[PDB]
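Thread: zinc ion complex, take 2
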Amino acid sequence: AMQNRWAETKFDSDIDEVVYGSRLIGSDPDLVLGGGNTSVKTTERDHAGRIISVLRVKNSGSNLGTIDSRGFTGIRMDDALAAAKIDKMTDEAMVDYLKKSMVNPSEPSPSVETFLHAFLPYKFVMHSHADAILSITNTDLPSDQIAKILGNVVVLPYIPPGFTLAKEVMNCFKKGIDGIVLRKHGLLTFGDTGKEAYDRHINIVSRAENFIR
Ligand SMILES: [Cl-]
Ligand SMILES: [Zn+2]
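Output below.
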């Protein structure tokens, strides 16, 4: 039975908190059998001394399980949120956009799923390709019955990973929900703190697992 392993309460920094959450998620082979990504929205000074809103998002330099602060690449939120105006973007264009939005271009490339994170207005966001979520969403169960099984969630149909997915995620987000379920892809959870996003992730996946058990 999936367990909830969140033990800490005090962290020195936002990055320490997101690293902690990432490690817990990457430690469960039923949550991360190489993919998944996390993020924290944070305040930083940029090179020009401006205090700015930064999305620190998982990068290509490590898996979630053994991640450290180096594994979080800083993306300007002003830049990322301005992308919401854009209609379509190819994967390639998306990568270029993100590169031009990096607070420090010498950091490792940010997750190709960065826009899932930027476009959800919670401080912490967690994304997995949880096996039990893939199973339940790969059945013929209607989405509404999937939602009744999993809890206070919104369920989205299959959409290929990329910019359109992020736009749909953005638009289906509603105040008060615990998660967004992406059929044939995975799960998004979020919250004001790392624990909130994490607890929501476990509760939903474990409900999925319970149901297919
Ligand atoms: Cl009912
Ligand atoms: Zn994904």
